[PDB]
Amino acid sequence: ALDRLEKDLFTLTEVEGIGFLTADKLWQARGGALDDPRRLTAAAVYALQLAGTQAGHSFLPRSRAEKGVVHYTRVTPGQARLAVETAVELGRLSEDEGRIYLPHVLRAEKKLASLIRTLLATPPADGNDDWAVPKKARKGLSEEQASVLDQLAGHRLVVLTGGPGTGKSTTTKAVADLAESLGLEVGLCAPTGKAARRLGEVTGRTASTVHRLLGYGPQGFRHNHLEPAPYDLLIVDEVSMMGDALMLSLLAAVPPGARVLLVGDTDQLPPVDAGLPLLALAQAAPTIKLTQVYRQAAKNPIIQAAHGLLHGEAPAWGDKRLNLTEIEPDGGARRVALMVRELGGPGAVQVLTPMRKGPLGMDHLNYHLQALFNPGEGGVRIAEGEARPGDTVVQTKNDYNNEIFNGTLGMVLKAEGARLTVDFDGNVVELTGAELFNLQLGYALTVHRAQGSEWGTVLGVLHEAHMPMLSRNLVYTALTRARDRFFSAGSASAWQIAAARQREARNTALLERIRA
DNA sequence: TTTTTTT
Ligand SMILES: Nc1ncnc2c1ncn2[C@@H]1O[C@H](COP(=O)(O)OP(=O)(O)NP(=O)(O)O)[C@@H](O)[C@H]1O
Numbered sequence: 464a465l466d467r468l469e470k471d472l473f474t475l476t477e478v479e480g481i482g483f484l485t486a487d488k489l490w491q492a493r494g495g496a497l498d499d500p501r502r503l504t505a506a507a508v509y510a511l512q513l514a515g516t517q518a519g520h521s522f523l524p525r526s527r528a529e530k531g532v533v534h535y536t537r538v539t540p541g542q543a544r545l546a547v548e549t550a551v552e553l554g555r556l557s558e559d560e561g562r563i564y565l566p567h568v569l570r571a572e573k574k575l576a577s578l579i580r581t582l583l584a585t586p587p588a589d590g591n592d593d594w595a596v597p598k599k600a601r602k603g604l605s606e607e608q609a610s611v612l613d614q615l616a617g618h619r620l621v622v623l624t625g626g627p628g629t630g631k632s633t634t635t636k637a638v639a640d641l642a643e644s645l646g647l648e649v650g651l652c653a654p655t656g657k658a659a660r661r662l663g664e665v666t667g668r669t670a671s672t673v674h675r676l677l678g679y680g681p682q683g684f685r686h687n688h689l690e691p692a693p694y695d696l697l698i699v700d701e702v703s704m705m706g707d708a709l710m711l712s713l714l715a716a717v718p719p720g721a722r723v724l725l726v727g728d729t730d731q732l733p734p735v736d737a738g739l740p741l742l743a744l745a746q747a748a749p750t751i752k753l754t755q756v757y758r759q760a761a762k763n764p765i766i767q768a769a770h771g772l773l774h775g776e777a778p779a780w781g782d783k784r785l786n787l788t789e790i791e792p793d794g795g796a797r798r799v800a801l802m803v804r805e806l807g808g809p810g811a812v813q814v815l816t817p818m819r820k821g822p823l824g825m826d827h828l829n830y831h832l833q834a835l836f837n838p839g840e841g842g843v844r845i846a847e848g849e850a851r852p853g854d855t856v857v858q859t860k861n862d863y864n865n866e867i868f869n870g871t872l873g874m875v876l877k878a879e880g881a882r883l884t885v886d887f888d889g890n891v892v893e894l895t896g897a898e899l900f901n902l903q904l905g906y907a908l909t910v911h912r913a914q915g916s917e918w919g920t921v922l923g924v925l926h927e928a929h930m931p932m933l934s935r936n937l938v939y940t941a942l943t944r945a946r947d948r949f950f951s952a953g954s955a956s957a958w959q960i961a962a963a964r965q966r967e968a969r970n971t972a973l974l975e976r977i978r979a
Numbered sequence: 980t981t982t983t984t985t986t
């Protein structure tokens with residue numbers, strides 16, 4: 464092994480665990496020439512990895528890559544070309560101002576388009592297909608919503624989009640009911656734990672994260688082409704939070720002839736990983752677009768403000784249903800908590816924040832919310848802070864023993880010593896030790912895990928202290944979680960900033976590959 | 980600099 468490492472130390476730049484950054488300091492602290500070609504070629508790989516990590520790009524034009532090397536390194540804009548070029552021919556980077564990718568990402572994008580291709584050209588079957596829509600099946604649905612039921616007939620891949628609150632996820636209960644009546648096995652999942660949880664609620668069925676559906680293991684996902692996921696119909700919600708990699712993994716596990724229904728809105732939150740497949744799919748596959756808003760009552764300021772965010776314009780606060788109260792990070796959380804009390808308490812208003820840490824982060828908001836509505840008796844320590852009877856808790860990690868999965872809300876029944884017994888939707892259970900780090904207080908929530916949920920009145924904390932997270936989709940997503948009233952706490956300028964900042968488009972050739 | 984998933 465280290466024969467490889469003595470020849471080139473920057474062999475870890477793309478190795479498990481450690482990355483370029485670490486191997487770089489371990490290279491400078493032990494001699495190492497910042498201009499050394501072995502460091503440059505590695506620096507180029509790091510540039511692309513970072514391109515996907517920070518901006519979600521699947522590739523970078525040769526130029527932007529050389530430029531990215533200069534910013535994440537520091538050599539001469541001429542040496543960079545040699546860095547990229549060396550990495551290219553060394554096979555550390557692939558090309559196709561060619562488009563350069565991390566080798567596996569090009570393969571990934573090519574196999575993904577391929578999978579989508581066959582999904583779009585093959586008929587659903589087991590040549591076995593009795594999909595038929597009984598009238599009772601479109602009961603309660605709108606014309607547009609019902610059309611999805613018809614579309615799944617004769618098509619293996621169907622996309623269901625529409626802005627927030629148009630009843631996409633709701634349409635899903637009907638689709639699943641139909642499927643079951645036809646004797647088909649239905650699998651339900653979403654990218655985040657809480658979203659999967661809500662998909663389950665509105666569907667009346669068991670749903671999980673895309674990771675648990677595929678059976679995540681040490682060797683990777685259990686389900687794939689050799690052992691497809693056991694479902695005839697696959698329903699995936701909140702698909703805009705799915706990156707290329709996960710999408711590839713899910714599609715590759717779809718039983719041949721089986722159906723896949725993707726539902727989501729690209730105007731909401733983009734994936735944390737690279738890519739944004741839903742954008743391509745919503746244009747290549749048969750899609751039905753819902754347009755009637757049901758979440759908020761017709762002509763509620765919220766709806767108009769949401770339309771404003773899509774055009775870089777902040778909300779016109781003032782209304783009893785759309786207001787903002789200025790606050791600073793200093794003594795901010797305390798204020799937010801008092802605003803909550805003034806609104807009926809934690810149970811009458813959901814608090815949302817863009818980040819977990821910081822004076823206005825989820826962790827500190829929780830503390831003040833806990834201190835204000837459930838003051839007292841030093842209970843059992845958990846993820847952050849402690850839990851005391853009466854506290855609302857959120858499962859954040861999967862617990863197979865008791866079968867409490869990421870995204871489940873619970874109520875602390877009692878905290879005795881180091882034994883925290885909680886009630887997770889009827890499933891009363893006792894937690895001790897390690898399993899205590901599987902949950903956090905649930906008074907405050909991040910916007911990312913809020914996607915897919917709705918509440919009557921929402922209180923979103925948005926302020927300059929959230930700078931890195933001030934994007935248009937983020938606030939559009941936060942604002943639209945509200946059914947009746949949306950109050951904001953922070954600064955009006957934060958919203959102006961957020962509305963004007965649309966994260967840059969993600970370099971992707973998925974659509975091109977599907978069509979070409 | 981930050982968001983998620985993870986037997
Ligand atoms: N056809 C309908 N008629 C009346 N109410 C409906 C209808 N469809 C959905 N709703 C209600 O609208 C709200 C649900 O919207 P939902 O199905 O979550 O839309 P969505 O597009 O999934 N929103 P989102 O996930 O944020 O993009 C609930 O009050 C549903 O009961």
Ligand SMILES: [Mg+2]
Nearest residue numbers: 631632633915
């Ligand atoms: Mg939904």
